[PDB]
Amino acid sequence: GHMEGKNKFNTYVVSFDYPSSYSSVFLRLRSLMYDMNFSSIVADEYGIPRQLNENSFAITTSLAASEIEDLIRLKCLDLPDIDFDLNIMTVDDYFRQFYK
């Protein structure tokens, strides 16, 4: 079996965009994140376990960015409705914007 290849679990960050009026709605989607492989903490480039629970989140997946998107957006069928827009990026790409 192809255990190889996907022996490299990467680390991504997802930046969700949505107005605060949908926070009550989004609480469903957030619960989906942690039900999935997403996390609230990830180490930065220095090595500090950062909290993401502002706006972005992280995941140890190795699928592609638009694959993470599809994963999340198909979980939107659980929640009522929220116009959210997410940007997947790698964790490194994330912390390079938000510093110490």
UniProtKB/Swiss-Prot annotation:
Keyword Nucleotide-binding: no
Induction: Post-transcriptionally down-regulated by MqsR which acts on the ghoST transcript selectively, degrading the ghoS segment while leaving ghoT intact; conditions which induce MqsR (e.g. overexpression, nalidixic acid, azolocillin or H(2)O(2)) decrease ghoS expression and thus increase ghoT transcripts.
Full protein name: Endoribonuclease antitoxin GhoS
Phenotype of the disrupted gene, per the record: Essential; cannot be disrupted unless ghoT is also disrupted; in the double ghoS-ghoT mutant has no visible phenotype. Increased biofilm formation after 8 hours at 30 and 37 degrees Celsius, has risen higher by 24 hours at 37 degrees Celsius but has fallen by 24 hours at 30 degrees Celsius. Approximately 2-fold increase in swimming motility. When single ghoT mutant is grown in the presence of antibiotics carbenicillin or cefoxitin initial metabolism is significantly increased over that of wild-type, after 14 hours wild-type is slightly less active.
Subunit annotation: Monomer.
Listed Gene3D superfamilies: 3.30.70.2360
Effect seen on changing M33L: Protein becomes toxic upon overexpression. Becomes classic type II TA toxin protein, increased cell persistence to ampicillin
Domain of life: Bacteria
Species assigned in the record: Escherichia coli (strain K12)
Assigned EC number: 3.1.-.-
InterPro entries: GhoS (IPR022597), GhoS_sf (IPR038241)
Cystine pairs: none
Pfam family name, one: GhoS
Additional comment: Has a similar 3D-structure to Cas2 proteins.
Keyword terms: Endonuclease, Hydrolase, Nuclease, Toxin-antitoxin system, Transcription, Transcription regulation
GO molecular function: RNA endonuclease activity
Signal peptide: none
Function as written in the Swiss-Prot or TrEMBL entry: Antitoxin component of a type V toxin-antitoxin (TA) system. Neutralizes the toxic effects of toxin GhoT by digesting ghoT transcripts in a sequence-specific manner. In concert with GhoT is involved in reducing cell growth during antibacterial stress. Overexpression leads to transcript level reduction of 20 other mRNAs involved in purine or pyrimidine synthesis and transport. Not seen to bind its own promoter DNA.
Tagged with keyword ATP-binding: no
Post-translational modifications: Unlike other TA proteinaceous antitoxins, this protein is stable with and without cellular stress; its structure has been determined in the absence of GhoT toxin.
